[PDB]
Amino acid sequence: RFLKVKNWETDVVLTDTLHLKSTLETGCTEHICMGSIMLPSVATKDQLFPLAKEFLDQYYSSIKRFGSKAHMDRLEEVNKEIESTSTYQLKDTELIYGAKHAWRNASRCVGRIQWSKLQVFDARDCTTAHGMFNYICNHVKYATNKGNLRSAITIFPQRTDGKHDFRVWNSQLIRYAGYKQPDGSTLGDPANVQFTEICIQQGWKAPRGRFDVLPLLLQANGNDPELFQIPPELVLEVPIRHPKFDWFKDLGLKWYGLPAVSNMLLEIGGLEFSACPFSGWYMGTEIGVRDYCDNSRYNILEEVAKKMDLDMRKTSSLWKDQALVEINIAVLYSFQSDKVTIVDHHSATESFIKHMENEYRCRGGCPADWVWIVPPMSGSITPVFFQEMLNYRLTPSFEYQPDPWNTHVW
Numbered sequence: 424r425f426l427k428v429k430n431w432e433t434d435v436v437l438t439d440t441l442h443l444k445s446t447l448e449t450g451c452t453e454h455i456c457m458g459s460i461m462l463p464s465v466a467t468k469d470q471l472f473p474l475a476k477e478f479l480d481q482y483y484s485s486i487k488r489f490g491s492k493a494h495m496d497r498l499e500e501v502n503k504e505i506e507s508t509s510t511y512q513l514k515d516t517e518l519i520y521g522a523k524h525a526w527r528n529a530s531r532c533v534g535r536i537q538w539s540k541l542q543v544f545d546a547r548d549c550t551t552a553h554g555m556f557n558y559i560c561n562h563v564k565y566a567t568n569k570g571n572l573r574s575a576i577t578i579f580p581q582r583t584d585g586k587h588d589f590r591v592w593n594s595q596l597i598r599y600a601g602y603k604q605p606d607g608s609t610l611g612d613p614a615n616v617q618f619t620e621i622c623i624q625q626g627w628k629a630p631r632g633r634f635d636v637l638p639l640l641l642q643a644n645g646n647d648p649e650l651f652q653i654p655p656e657l658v659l660e661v662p663i664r665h666p667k668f669d670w671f672k673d674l675g676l677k678w679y680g681l682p683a684v685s686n687m688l689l690e691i692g693g694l695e696f697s698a699c700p701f702s703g704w705y706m707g708t709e710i711g712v713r714d715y716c717d718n719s720r721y722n723i724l725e726e727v728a729k730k731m732d733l734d735m736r737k738t739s740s741l742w743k744d745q746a747l748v749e750i751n752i753a754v755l756y757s758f759q760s761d762k763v764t765i766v767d768h769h770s771a772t773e774s775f776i777k778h779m780e781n782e783y784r785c786r787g788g789c790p791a792d793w794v795w796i797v798p799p800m801s802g803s804i805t806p807v808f809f810q811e812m813l814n815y816r817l818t819p820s821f822e823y824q825p826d827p828w829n830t831h832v833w
């Protein structure tokens with residue numbers, strides 16, 4: 424009941440007991456392993472105080488006042504407000520703790536060494552899609568910090584009944600538009616073409632280029648969402664050059680500095696925050712491997728390998744592999760020559776192993792998803808390839824949620 428994870432590059436072993444505190448199910452049974460399925464699958468007051476009890480107990484058991492009366496009066500206070508209103512509200516300190524631990528428990532995140540250094544923006548007083556748009560601009564500006572990126576989350580009012588829900592309809596706050604062409608093909612980002620249509624549907628005026636920043640579709644208190652365009656001076660973008668190849672400029676590629684996921688749900692003490700955009704900084708491979716070279720994304724390996732003049736008749740020339748390394752040299756180089764925060768997959772996996780140690784020491788475990796932790800290129804020349812990870816679901820936590828245009832009573 425006190426399981427062991429081994430590292431095979433180092434022969435180092437650690438003991439996981441943190442998984443005893445786990446609660447939610449994983450998809451795996453004693454006779455089936457779902458570790459590579461992407462997404463496996465009102466809340467009453469009878470269930471809401473147990474979750475409120477569990478959260479608050481570890482929150483006072485973090486500030487070395489577990490079991491005190493300051494704890495007990497807080498437990499009694501939440502208990503009775505869960506009688507009165509049936510729901511409850513978190514303290515400022517309980518929200519900052521809960522948010523930082525949702526990140527800390529996010530087993531699919533390799534950059535979690537930074538989990539404590541997070542800036543929480545309490546937007547629970549927000550009421551309008553314009554108020555949402557204000558909070559979100561202030562997040563963008565702060566989290567960007569002139570390229571010296573800082574991580575942050577903005578927490579909008581929690582779900583109450585179920586109809587009245589704050590939702591950022593964008594998947595990330597900043598993404599490039601996606602238009603399918605009359606000739607069947609696709610301009611911009613193909614992942615967003617469904618979204619982009621809903622944007623033009625709500626009256627967006629598309630510039631119809633490659634790297635068009637989408638507007639925000641912000642839904643406030645269950646209301647029909649409204650389009651707002653982040654001021655372009657707030658959207659920091661990096662033009663992508665290669666430090667050897669001058670033809671690389673003519674590829675005319677760029678990316679935005681700020682990775683800010685907006686479509687997930689923040690669970691704290693049984694409360695559900697449907698709108699909780701959180702931002703850090705990019706690991707190089709997300710842009711240079713996935714965004715740029717996924718077949719159903721920008722799919723640029725074709726053209727990069729051309730300009731390198733590569734043996735493209737043969738699958739086995741590793742022409743694909745060769746153009747993939749140059750592209751991530753170009754992402755990295757470009758972001759750093761502009762002083763915009765980016766981390767390479769070597770230094771990020773190293774930090775994660777480093778983070779993983781401290782978690783097994785001063786916490787007794789680190790939930791971790793190998794399928795997601797291993798970078799999508801050069802897997803085994805990074806140290807996380809050789810690290811056995813235990814995946815389990817701790818709380819507070821970030822969760823996926825449905826897209827709102829497929830659930831909203833419109």
Ligand code: HEM
Nearest residue numbers: 526529531532533534537574576701702703704705706821
């Ligand atoms: C310090 C900078 C950060 C780095 C370098 C980093 C790194 C990464 C990477 C590479 C991924 C994989 C993304 C993908 O493959 O689609 C990821 C996912 C994730 N990150 Fe981190 N991240 C950072 C900050 C944050 C913050 C600030 C939060 C939350 C407050 C967070 C929570 C998550 C979660 C929940 C996921 C998984 C979401 C999903 O399953 O799609 N990360 N991160």
Ligand SMILES: CNCc1cccc(-c2cc(C)cc(N)n2)c1
Nearest residue numbers: 682683684701702703704705706
């Ligand atoms: C399923 N995609 C989730 C997703 C998509 C795109 C980017 C991220 C991300 C988020 C943060 C905070 C940091 C980082 N380096 N990347 C996450």
Ligand SMILES: C[C@H](O)[C@H](O)[C@H]1CNc2nc(N)[nH]c(=O)c2N1
Nearest residue numbers: 458459460461794795796797799
């Ligand atoms: C089918 C498979 O689970 C899927 O491709 C996963 C694999 N690992 C991943 N890992 C990361 N970091 N990001 C991803 O999108 C995925 N996709």
Ligand SMILES: [Zn+2]
Nearest residue numbers: 451456457458
């Ligand atoms: Zn499994």
